[PDB]
Design a protein around this ligand. Sequence first.
Ligand SMILES: [Ca+2]
Lengths: 661, 660, 661
Amino acid sequence: NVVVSNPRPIFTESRSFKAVANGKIYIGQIDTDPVNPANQIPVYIENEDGSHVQITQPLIINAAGKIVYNGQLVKIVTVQGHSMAIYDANGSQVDYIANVLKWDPDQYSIEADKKFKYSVKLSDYPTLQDAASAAVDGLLIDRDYNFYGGETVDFGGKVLTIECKAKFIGDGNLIFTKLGKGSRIAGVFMESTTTPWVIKPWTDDNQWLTDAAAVVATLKQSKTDGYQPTVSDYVKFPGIETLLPPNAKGQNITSTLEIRECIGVEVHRASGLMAGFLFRGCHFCKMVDANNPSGGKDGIITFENLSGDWGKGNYVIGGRTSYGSVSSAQFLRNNGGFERDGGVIGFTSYRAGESGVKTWQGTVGSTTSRNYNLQFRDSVVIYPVWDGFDLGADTDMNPELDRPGDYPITQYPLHQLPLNHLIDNLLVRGALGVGFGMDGKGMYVSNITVEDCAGSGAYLLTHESVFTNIAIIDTNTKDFQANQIYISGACRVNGLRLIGIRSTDGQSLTIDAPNSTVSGITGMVDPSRINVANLAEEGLGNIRANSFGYDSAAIKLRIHKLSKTLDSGALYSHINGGAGSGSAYTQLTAISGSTPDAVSLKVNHKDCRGAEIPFVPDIASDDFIKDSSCFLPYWENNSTSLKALVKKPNGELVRLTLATL
Amino acid sequence: VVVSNPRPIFTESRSFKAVANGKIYIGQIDTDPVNPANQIPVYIENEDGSHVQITQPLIINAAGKIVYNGQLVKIVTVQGHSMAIYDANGSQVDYIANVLKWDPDQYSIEADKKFKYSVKLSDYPTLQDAASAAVDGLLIDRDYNFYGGETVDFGGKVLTIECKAKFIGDGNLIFTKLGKGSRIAGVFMESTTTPWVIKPWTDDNQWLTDAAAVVATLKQSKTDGYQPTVSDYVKFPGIETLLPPNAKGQNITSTLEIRECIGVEVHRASGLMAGFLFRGCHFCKMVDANNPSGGKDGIITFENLSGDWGKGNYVIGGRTSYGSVSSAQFLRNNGGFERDGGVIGFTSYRAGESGVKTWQGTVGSTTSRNYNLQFRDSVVIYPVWDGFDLGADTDMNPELDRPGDYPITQYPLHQLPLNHLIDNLLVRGALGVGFGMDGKGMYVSNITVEDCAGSGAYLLTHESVFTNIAIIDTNTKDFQANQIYISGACRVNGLRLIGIRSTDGQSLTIDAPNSTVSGITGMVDPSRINVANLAEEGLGNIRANSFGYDSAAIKLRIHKLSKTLDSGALYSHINGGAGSGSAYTQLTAISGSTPDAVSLKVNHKDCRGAEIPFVPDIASDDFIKDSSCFLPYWENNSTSLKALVKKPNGELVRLTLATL
Amino acid sequence: NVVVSNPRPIFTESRSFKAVANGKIYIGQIDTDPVNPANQIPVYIENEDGSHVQITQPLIINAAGKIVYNGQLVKIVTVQGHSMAIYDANGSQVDYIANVLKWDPDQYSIEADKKFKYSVKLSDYPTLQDAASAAVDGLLIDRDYNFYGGETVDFGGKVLTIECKAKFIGDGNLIFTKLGKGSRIAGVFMESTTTPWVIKPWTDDNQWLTDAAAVVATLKQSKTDGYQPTVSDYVKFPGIETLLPPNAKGQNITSTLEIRECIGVEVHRASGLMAGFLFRGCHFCKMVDANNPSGGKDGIITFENLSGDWGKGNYVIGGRTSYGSVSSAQFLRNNGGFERDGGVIGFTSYRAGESGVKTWQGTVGSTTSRNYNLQFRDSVVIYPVWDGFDLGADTDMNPELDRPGDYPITQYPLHQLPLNHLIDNLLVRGALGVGFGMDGKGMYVSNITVEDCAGSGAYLLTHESVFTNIAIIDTNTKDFQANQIYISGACRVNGLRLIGIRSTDGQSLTIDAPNSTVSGITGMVDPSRINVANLAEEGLGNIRANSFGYDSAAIKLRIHKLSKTLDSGALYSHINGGAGSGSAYTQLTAISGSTPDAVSLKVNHKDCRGAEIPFVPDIASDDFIKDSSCFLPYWENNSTSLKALVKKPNGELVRLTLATL
Ligand SMILES: [Ca+2]
């Protein structure tokens, strides 16, 4: 409701009831005398269409007490608050107001400025920068915003809480800079403008495709449920480079939120399609509870600190991601320090086009991309095209001969860096590459479970390292020419579960750990497919061997130097008669002529209650008897007699007759 | 406020005079209001606030003030307007194209831009009124008594609903049409009714099992127990008849229902007799539940019996307590290959049914089953029934088809390809079964079930793999049950059995008749192991360290022969005492159902010789097994040892071996 | 911008065009007659300086129609809502306005008050109490606030969301009281004013210092990268008490946020320097996602409930802390109930000056400081000066003879309270004292991993307790006179991994658990360094012993009561000839005269296909033969004959001739 009123002011005298006819008005700085030029401020006629014309002072008051310019009634305005002095035609002062704002003070605005939460919203601004400049505390993203690649926003060092309720859409990087420590960005949703060509190298039954032509046949234009091919696919799927159409090669679609050179910024509940998150030269930043962004061409979550100080304080905490052409979560040139201040905790990666979690190896540009002292715990990687966890620091194939910006090779050889990562409680399932890969010297690794992988379970280029409670369960299910677990260097493994339900008959070795000392293997492993430097159970208690569904129980010995495929000796218990007979025989055996159990001593065969003793089947040579005060029975066929080669207590030999007709 | 004179006066523009008998025309902005087509309504506004519309022009009196019927009046318009003033001779005194452009209150413009939008329930009579007014935030700042089925339409808006007071009522408060990304934080649901609840555990936290004892715990409370259900009639046989009618068939729950929404998260929820229902939702999460105390229905339910299969639905973090049925439950959800859904980082205490439940069977005429969910990093303590119930098929009537699911002819009962990602789960105190599941082709890892009155695990699984399972002091009530049962042909790699409680009062520890197992650790009674095959194929060089009084033992047992008697053994026994430097080694075999009946010894009494058992009477031809061996036997009437010799050529001869 | 107007009011007549010369104005309550003094309200002259002088009515109008007071023009002010009556010089009413506000009504405040989020901010108030009193919903800390020790703020029972974007700066405690249930405090940053002297008992290669003089040598003034010495350091580094200068002793610097006697308050994403967080007398409070506060003199996170009801519902959830002089997270007099409603889940502690997580022991003040029914799960403690987890309830050194406020010693002996904590999935690395310590009766503990600790791995003063899947891997690496794991009482251990890659030759026992029954040891343990009451593997299947790196395989027996260092017998398989000979011999041995393997029976030595049988090297005594229907061969040297001591089937002894020339 608008009340009818008379907005145009009139100016009347102070001691009688008259207009200030032919008077003058001066307008100036608050609490000054505006009659003096130095104190005057710009005054403008304001026109109906909202245009302005600056005029000179004094303002002229006509005979009716109204302001006029060249005799025409005008509306005068000023940019800021002002003092006002009114003079009559004789030049006597009629009135003076030091500050006109003080006459009609809007008290509500003082109260409102104090009692309401400050937030600006993108719907009120043409550009994101405009909103950012206006922001004091909150910034609401409340309209879908088309950004251009490289669009850069300066947040002015302010500590902002950016609440996203709409998308940032575009191909390329949206770059946020100069956010103050403590700033948070919640609910951000990045989406590419472009819909790329993607491959989907898995079937409707979730089996991995390995054939290049089969993979090419999956090409579709989509922002999800697949990934844009990269040059690593040319290696992963031999022959695919030639078979892909040109429009499916060299694509580069990612919509990336880039946090540049900020400290103490967290991105919470991020999501998107063809989406990427890049922390470039950041410290003490976190990607928290990622809400399953579907990846594009670049890493989904990247902490890259190739320039400036080594990254520290950078974490992926919770959440999950899906797809992407390369790794889900990756680090370059981060060092958590002794305090292990950084890494990946509580994270899930699904279907990384490369690996679920990656610490980069080798030189990138002019310097090291490697990482030290990071945590990798309580995390899960499922169905990566390459690796579950890739925690190596030195290049496997075609390694550099040096490490600019890192420890020289002369100090630490390749794969022997003191990486010092805290690695515990990780699960990997469905990896096509390697479930769990790493390198380094002096590493402690615990509670790692790798299961149901088409590719190898683990590939460990580690040295003087300790692995505790490792489970490698049905890996290399495609039976590639690979081990299920490989360890290069001289390591200790304490607890190693091998074999689920899949046969290893179509594979090479299960564990190849030629310099490693191992204890506590469990599972239905084919002992011929074990290679270690040493295997021992030094600390077992009293033992029982329980046999089910066989007529015997066995405690066997296998000397791998003699033979990896044949037991060299055994202690058996064998049933006499059948079930419930109350009788069994015990048998001690030795291999001869590569025939297991060729020679044996028996106790209670056929419940006879006696020992059956093997004898030498012809004349025994002197050197057949080993120890003093022992005898060795032997056969003399021509007299149908048993003889005994005796090594007497004094060590001398004598031949006796033992049994005759 | 400055004491001012609000009533306008209108004076002329050429000389200082009132516009006596002047005329004012009021119309559309930027038009000529003298034209009636440009005029807008003008009203007298009375002191009591009533209005009366009058004709134009407005009349100015001798004093320069607007008048109607000889009285000074206040005139108002509904919109911004043009104003033209004419004097008694029709000369124009003034023209204002838009009176609002003279000094607009610029504050509302700046305020609307700089402040966060939020409405609050204290300003509205109903929750719908508040939802309608909301733009960004909605604050629940007063307790609100809802009626069952009360339905709120949020208009597709992406709202941040902050709760700092209670929703109070029996039944469901139903939220609908929230936009993707909406969040509801701190919600507290509380029933109006205080029901009758049972508390089937003692002040020393032992479960009660006697129906009469449980009935004796009846009290009216919204917590520290649960409303009896139909399942209690089975759990406590006879309780149905002993419970008074007022304790039976109660249905008190105050439920926040999120209906048919996508991308809604409920965070830090709590309450008393509280439930949370996501009905026909996708990509919704129950996050960091702040220990709501449950009612009759499930505490957290993702139910997708209608519409598309549920996906993207999770319980993440938090905990719940009590409730008559399961704490967290799923019907007709499929996480896809991506495993996009399930329960991670969750704790359940004292579920009246189970901690985490995936429904089995048909419900509402379709499948209630679930696929491809995660169950990880979660803990369930003191459920009345199960810790985790992750089965999909009902363990009965294997003929029955699965409407809405895989046909029974494609996948038999309990052999669905459920494909859940199950890892790192802990259960303690279950009265029913700690960990239960079915399915074919399952992988399960890092499960620990300890200190359970009921069985540790009940696995109706087929061609499945279990890695690093620990079942420690379960079936502590000594029900006629196993500690772990596995029906189908599975592999177990790493199974820890037995804590500090004796199994002397129990039947089988593990009954897994089709399963192949390796790596059992613990003081299991070997008679209480039943498996298809047990083996340690990959041990290294071995040492058996005995802390016993005078011996160490490596025993053999053939379960086909006897489940309770060792069939043979390798012993080492001390000669003399501690520090003697001497022991004897002994190889034994069972005969006449007497373990160790027959043996060969090396170094008995430090004699440095081998004591060899001989057949105590004439040896039959078939007593000797292998060629180039001899078997000593006794001939009493010559006080001699003979030897039955099987020569190298396989033929038998009998020789004299020792005589007087 | 601002329009030029004439703010000073003029009062003119209603029926003719004249000023109300020498008129009178009355001002009173809305919709009343203000000429009645009962209805009048205060009116004020507002001077130019903004000051006010109350005057009595009526207001006086001059010949110009303007308000005057003793002949000077004046600005009169009063409350928004009022009635106004104007009278001419004759006392005739000129006008009456029932309610001046109703003329040009501000509708905006009504709309604004409904549509905007309420938050007050510290920049608008001189003191934190001022802001707290003004708050309704939100409270923003947008300026650094210097507090004094003991400064107490009462939040009126209001449910407040306190968002911190600046620091609370001060030595001592800032005390928050009377927060309503559901209140939350986010991003708080406590910082001390003092930079104290701190010690840093670790080197640049992250080796612990143990020498007092070396530790004193590390003294520096800093708020981080070390801690203030306390009296426990006197014990930890013997001699340091006398070597520290006075300025480094008795320091007491912590900047502590104290939440006092509140219910349902959560502190989220807290940080700081020399910072502490104390919940005193609270219930249902949480310290969530601690953002690596760097600690001071007192515990970093403390739930202290020594008065009032036992603490319940109090958790540390997520996050991490660093440094501090004492423990990172600690509890006094909390009981989670059967519900286990409280504890530590998901937490990381680095470099606690005492322990990572501590449940207090003994009497504090006049009552129990102990704790029951708490969770300790999914947490990690790295590099504590004392313990990783200290979950004991009873005092170790000079214990109390009683437990005021708790169970009596007569009901539960020392170290044997039914603490009932839910303990699972814990990792400790780098502890200088004890990695994992506890006491209690009836405890269940599972999935504990302790690795690479200078001090002992575990010290368990527990009884009738159960430990499942424990790993103690390279602990006591400094070779203190200690065990790697000690357990005092009658416990069960099911799964125990011992030994990483470090030799134990410099140590005493690896496990000393004299009253415990243990199964499932894995690792390269020295068997002489195991002490338990009972060690057994009752439930193994068929067994194979696989030997790598040797010409033989072994299944050995050791009777620890006979000898802890020498095996008492063995079953061996030994290669005959070369590798790939396909022949081996089996040997069964027994110790004699303290020489392992002194006496043995062989099968297939030198591939001879016969059994080599040891005989008594002199005349056998009657008592040498054990069982009926057995014979024992023995040597009669004078005649060059083997005889047999025969125990006939009827048990009677006879001596026969077995072999002669
Ligand atoms: Ca003879």
